[PDB]
């Protein structure tokens, strides 16, 4: 069962929720059948540093200290 709340103002059956006070969407169901269908699913890409902490490449540093409080 699939529950397509068109809203947020700017086999398997479908329990869509209409809840109207406007009567002027003119498209819940196709957009409901749009929100229902799976589309080109990008694989979960993985994270990695590209600049690691090199022991042979070391940083800079300025002298002064911040005003403590």
């Amino acid at each position: 069962q699939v529950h397509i709340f068109w809203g947020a103002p700017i086999t398997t059956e479908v329990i869509l929720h209409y809840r109207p006070c406007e009567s002027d969407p003119t498209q819940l169901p196709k957009i409901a059948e749009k929100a229902i269908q799976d589309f080109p699913t990008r694989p979960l890409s993985r994270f990695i540093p590209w600049f690691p902490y090199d022991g042979s490449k070391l940083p800079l540093r300025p002298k002064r200290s911040p005003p403590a409080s």
């Binding site: 397509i4 068109w6 929720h17 929100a35 589309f39 994270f47």
Partner: protein, 127 residues
């Protein structure tokens, strides 16, 4: 407990909306209202909007026909460009984690409809 997991989903939906910049109106600001370190909306219209969407899925979620809570972020054509899919298989540890999750999940990534077909949030995003 679902009476507060719905508000956890509230947390989720607005934080997705927030980090995605789906609107330029910066209404969002830190809100620990009733000691919940989560960043909801300041539109009571929309807080009660999530409240009654979850109210009308309350005769509908814990009935366990649920196979995935797909919070779609819609598009200009009202298209599911980013289906933030949450598997319904259920203590702040998850919450921040989910929060963490969402953030680190938006890590790779760059108008929402709450469709309802380990809270393994995964994003089906356009390639």
């Amino acid at each position: 407990v679902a009476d507060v997991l719905c508000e956890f989903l509230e947390v989720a939906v607005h934080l997705i909306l927030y980090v995605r910049e789906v609107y330029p109106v910066g209404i969002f600001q830190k809100r620990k209202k009733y000691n919940v370190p989560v960043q909801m909306s300041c539109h009571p219209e929309l807080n009660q909007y999530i409240q009654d969407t979850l109210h009308c899925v309350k005769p509908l979620l814990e009935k366990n026909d649920v196979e995935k809570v797909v919070v779609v972020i819609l598009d200009k054509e009202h298209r599911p460009v980013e289906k933030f899919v949450f598997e319904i298989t259920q203590v702040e540890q998850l919450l921040r984690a989910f929060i963490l999750k969402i953030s680190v999940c938006d890590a790779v990534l760059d108008t929402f409809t709450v469709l309802v077909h380990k809270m393994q949030l995964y994003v089906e995003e356009r390639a």
